[PDB]
Amino acid sequence: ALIICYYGKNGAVIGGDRRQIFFRGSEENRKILEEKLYSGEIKSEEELYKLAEKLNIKIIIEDDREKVRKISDSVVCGEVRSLGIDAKRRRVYATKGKCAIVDILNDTVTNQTIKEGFGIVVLGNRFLKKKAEEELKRTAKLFPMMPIQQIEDAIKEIFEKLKWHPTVSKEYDIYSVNKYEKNFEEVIKKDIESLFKYREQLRKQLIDFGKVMSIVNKIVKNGEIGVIKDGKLHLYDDYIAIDKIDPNPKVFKVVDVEGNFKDGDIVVIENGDMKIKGTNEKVTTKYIIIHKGSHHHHH
Amino acid sequence: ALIICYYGKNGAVIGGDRRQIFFRGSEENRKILEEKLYSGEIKSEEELYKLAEKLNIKIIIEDDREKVRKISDSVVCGEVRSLGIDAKRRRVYATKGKCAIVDILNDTVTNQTIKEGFGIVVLGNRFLKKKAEEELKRTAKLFPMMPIQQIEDAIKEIFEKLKWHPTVSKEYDIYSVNKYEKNFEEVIKKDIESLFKYREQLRKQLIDFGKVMSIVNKIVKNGEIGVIKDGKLHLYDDYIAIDKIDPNPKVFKVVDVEGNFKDGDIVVIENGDMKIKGTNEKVTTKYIIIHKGSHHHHH
């Protein structure tokens, strides 16, 4: 990944590539290739796969998503992410005269530095930042007096100069603004809050997924479920019934059933077929029956 | 895992342990430890973890679930599973006089052999089957004339004789029957059909999980969503609205909105706040707005 951002009174400009590389392998080989990629010895994508193949580790390049956003006519943002044990992020926000470098670990903002004036921020691996510096070190001081367009282009040249490297996609996005954001801190706090809501939603859906699957596993294949009291299936304290396969379904102790039966008869199931114990005549119901406990025969 | 099953006219008896061992590591080291475990050179659980630790591969033993079931007073079942690229299974069903060895790959029954008479079937790894054979080879011929209880016990001794090995849990379950199942083939077909329904449900829930999460990702942070036509928010062809965060939500093109506005006004969003373009006055709605496409800025 590579993000280059400029901020000044003339405006904010930010360019970013789209490359994300996933690794799937052992710890040592992950770390060995991880360093060799940023060491600068890896030339192009050919030697990446080929060396990764030698280390019996699969890598998956994905250039299909933008690292940079134009939040408004006043603000632009660029994000780099590094996922593993933890979900580490590095964002850079920018506007007319101001710039904010934010550091996120999981669901927390570790650091947030805001700056007023003129400057350039570059996010990426150690190799690209080293290389990008040596392009900017000369040309950077001409930025403050340039127009926006010329800076966008100046940055475009830097991406074209570097994109050959396999940590950078061959295509890139650039967004710019020349309006000042009055509530620059609030805008950033609100954009970040969305991330934490998304992670919350992700965890809430993940919990509800398992919660549904548990229920599916609790569906009674074979059991002695209840007795027909007063023309209705009274279920034992062990089993319960539910209307849908939902995460939080409605519980029922007494259930409506259709078939040939009387009061006092024992209701059973075998191989998913609900029948009368002794009669072996077929019985139907609109509701799904399950064990109350998630433990039947250990878990 | 270890399953030992007897079948005869005297009845069916089946014993099974509860041990499942998961591996998480590279392909070669998975295969290297995989063979060394079944080679017989691995003595106990101490040398398992210790050797697995040397190969930088984590193993997770779980003895918390039964491998054997008593489907009815006529049928008993015992299952061994081996999960990896594919989900390979080996079940053994048994009843009075009959026995069925079933082979499943994923959602298909590869083989199904049924037998009438007297016999013993053992499921497990190559080491245990070798060892179990050499216990049974002598004592097996006494089974056909024994009672059920004595066979259960005979099998209990075999488990106690072998459980020291780390591919076998120190506790085990045993179930037996002495009734003949009239529709032995149908019972098995119905028990298996449940597995395929469970895998179907698992895939349906997994699809719907993503289907909901896609929608959450399509929620509009910043967009020019529509225009107020005839006192109602007419949405463009690009955006749509939904009532809930559901997997299959109800779509809306025209939406009820509350606020200060008139006909012809453009409706926009920035930082999740819905407002009137030009006015910047706050506008509310009961429905969630999303991009129609799942592609906005690439995916």
Binding site: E35, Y38, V80, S82, G84, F118, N125 | -
Partner: peptide, 26 residues
């Protein structure tokens, strides 16, 4: 165990943020 295993397995751009960002004040 499953949610645990994926974080132990997949690794997106590790070490890509192990160093400070490059800054220039103009």
């Amino acid at each position: 165990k499953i949610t645990q295993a994926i974080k132990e397995c997949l690794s997106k751009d590790p070490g890509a943020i192990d160093e400070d960002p490059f800054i220039i004040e103009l």
